[PDB]
Design an enzyme around this catalytic site. Structure first.
Site, mmCIF file in Angstrom:
data_model
loop_
_atom_site.group_PDB
_atom_site.id
_atom_site.type_symbol
_atom_site.label_atom_id
_atom_site.label_comp_id
_atom_site.label_asym_id
_atom_site.label_seq_id
_atom_site.Cartn_x
_atom_site.Cartn_y
_atom_site.Cartn_z
ATOM 1 N N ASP A 1 36.639 44.616 44.065
ATOM 2 C CA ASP A 1 37.902 43.768 44.695
ATOM 3 C C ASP A 1 39.082 44.448 43.847
ATOM 4 O OD1 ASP A 1 39.556 41.953 45.896
ATOM 5 O OD2 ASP A 1 39.259 40.481 44.320
ATOM 6 N N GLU B 1 37.093 44.740 49.369
ATOM 7 C CA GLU B 1 37.754 43.851 50.170
ATOM 8 C C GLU B 1 39.065 44.706 50.586
ATOM 9 O OE1 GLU B 1 38.149 40.120 47.996
ATOM 10 O OE2 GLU B 1 40.175 39.996 48.957
ATOM 11 N N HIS C 1 38.465 38.036 40.558
ATOM 12 C CA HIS C 1 38.323 39.386 41.081
ATOM 13 C C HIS C 1 36.992 39.733 41.004
ATOM 14 C CE1 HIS C 1 42.537 41.077 41.492
ATOM 15 N NE2 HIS C 1 42.846 39.667 40.858
#
Lengths: 157, 157
Positions: free
Chosen positions: A7, A70, A134
């Protein structure tokens, strides 16, 4: 199958590895979870270089079949470093957005983040939801990929 | 009581926080565990500065009653950064060597490290022994301090 999820973040870069079971309801074990944390005082090249070094170290050590990320300029820098590492490690990259993660793990595109985090805690068998966000996100992205990989709709960046 | 334990290292600095129960056999819960990882390419000031920033962030967020550190020049740098953070956070520092950790958690001064790591896994109720060794060490040091704090033989640096 073994999957790295990532992420890309503001000052934190979530980086996790999971091993997912081949049969039954989506079930995985946490192999690794870390957050690359950067400071305002350290120069840009160090921030991005460290991200690279950490991701490459994780890919080499854990040998995942896939890297899942992501989905602006500076976040782009972090993802740049990630992409370099995957290239050097010979690992394919797949990208998923927030809505796909929500759909895969919560069953609707507009689910709340808390619902996704509850499922990640569930699927990984954790006592508590994995902190920080995260890291929770990077694990969700990893598990999202495994879900679509199973049913053959993996989205390769 | 809430204790931060720290293991000053070569390229890794173990940093953990535990909350220990006030009665019964030594029992704690993991509140936080991280490893500050440094690279050969990043300059010395960044390596030490990050350590400082991470430790200070942990002390401010978790508000431990104590910082516990395991017991040469460059390791001294890392501990320097740690000491600065404890000074700014107003948190007392206690130092323990390998033998005291072994004595407190394994019951003999010459116990193997694996025995200490087994007890840390036991006391914290973890599924597996906490990885990596710098983190396992930092938790052990934290729990070592709590042990001597209970019986009133804490060693303040």
């Amino acid at each position: 199958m073994v999957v790295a999820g990532i992420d890309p973040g503001i000052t934190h870069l979530g980086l996790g590895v999971v091993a997912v079971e081949g049969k039954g309801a989506l079930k995985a074990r946490l192999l690794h979870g870390e957050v690359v944390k950067t400071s305002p005082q350290e120069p840009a090249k160090e921030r991005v270089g460290r991200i690279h070094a950490r991701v490459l170290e994780v890919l080499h050590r854990f040998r995942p079949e896939a890297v899942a990320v992501e989905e602006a300029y500076k976040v782009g820098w972090a993802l740049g470093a990630v992409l370099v590492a995957a290239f050097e490690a010979g690992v394919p990259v797949y990208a998923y957005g927030p809505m796909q993660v929500k759909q895969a793990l919560a069953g609707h595109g507009h689910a709340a983040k808390e619902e996704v985090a509850l499922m990640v805690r569930g699927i990984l068998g954790l006592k508590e939801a994995p902190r920080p966000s995260h890291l929770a996100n990077a694990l969700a992205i990893a598990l999202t990929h495994a879900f679509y990989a199973r049913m053959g709709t993996a989205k390769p960046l």
